Symmetry: C2
Subunit: 217 residues, 2 copies
């Protein structure tokens, strides 16, 4: 990968989507140290704004070539290049919210290109997401296992709620390489995603993640 | 220090302090994996509550024996035990709030004890601390270096504001071991302090830190 994924790598994204009908179009840029598990992202609502829901349901959809892997642990999403990989995710929240996401990752001109497609459905409108009472995602840990010749990962995740409580979402995600690649083992990735800046409308937002692969206790 | 510091270790803390003349007494507890850089803390306002200011100015005072070091970097804090270490900090906010902190660290019955004294003054009375408008410390990195047989450390920190605005602070900390210990080197350490849980009135709050040592770059 030394030759395809370099110590610093830049990326661009476009997301088409809808939460409960509301269509939005977002267009973003990022850049980061991939072998160190640290990335950044600048985003902008490019149609739909002000978005009538929480950025957080959208946050973990704006980069797993940038996960610090040990050398004992193999980096599926890095060795997936220059060809790429795709993930389709299901997020089940407690109030009944359901986000289903599909994404295509590409490498062209030394820049990662990411095309994301998002659909939110049946979100309680007396709930945090639509009432915008969420305050960042709590730190997280995901268990990554292989199955059916692809890599699968689950999270039992909670969103920080403004008052002081949580909001439980369950992530299942499948990753598949556009080419044939050796699958990692039963491993776990540890990560935190932060909104570091924004405007009052969340029509422009700044983000940062740190992710490291590991084993179990 | 593998006879004094264990893979999993627990701590207790008492903070007495003053903000703009107000007096508060906190008492708390934590645990964590000191060789993984991770740790959790549940505190409580035991006198002075509801606190008339932002918890964030208090977050970084309630953990450097909880920082993952490389082998090439020497852990001054882990080696300052069981006799322990002392530290004292200065925080200068843009608006002109000054916080000077002092703390004593000791290990008794293999439980860390912390005793914090904190004195906040000249906090502007229409500012993002006295109007509780802050929403998290931004991720940071500390320029740790030696001077006068002690360890000093600088941070150009920022606080997140509930409108997308950051709020600048300026950390200077001095670390002193109650014993003779080899001083480390010109190094940098990264961290992210998350308020994971909390009650409405911030009379009960839960915290999380991740902290890993490194060299420049």
């Amino acid at each position: 990968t030394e030759d395809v994924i370099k110590e610093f790598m830049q990326f661009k994204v476009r997301m088409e989507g809808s939460v409960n009908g509301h269509y939005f179009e977002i267009e973003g840029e990022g850049e980061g140290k991939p072998y160190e598990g640290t990335q950044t992202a600048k985003l902008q609502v490019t149609k739909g704004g002000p978005l009538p829901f929480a950025w957080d349901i959208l946050s973990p959809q704006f980069s797993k070539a940038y996960v610090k892997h040990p050398a004992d642990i193999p980096d599926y999403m890095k060795l997936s290049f220059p060809e790429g990989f795709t993930w389709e995710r299901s997020m089940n929240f407690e109030d009944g919210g359901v986000v289903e996401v599909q994404q295509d990752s590409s490498l062209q001109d030394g820049t990662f290109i990411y095309k994301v497609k998002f659909k939110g459905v049946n979100f309680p409108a007396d709930g945090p997401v639509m009432q915008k009472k969420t305050a960042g995602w709590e730190p997280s840990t995901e268990k990554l296992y292989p199955q059916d010749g692809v890599l699968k990962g689950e999270i039992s995740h909670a969103l920080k709620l403004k008052d002081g409580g949580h909001y439980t979402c369950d992530f299942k995600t499948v990753y598949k390489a556009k080419k044939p690649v050796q699958l990692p083992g039963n491993h776990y990735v540890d990560s935190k995603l932060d909104i570091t800046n924004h405007n009052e409308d969340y029509t422009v937002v700044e983000q940062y993640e740190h992710a490291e692969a590991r084993h179990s206790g």
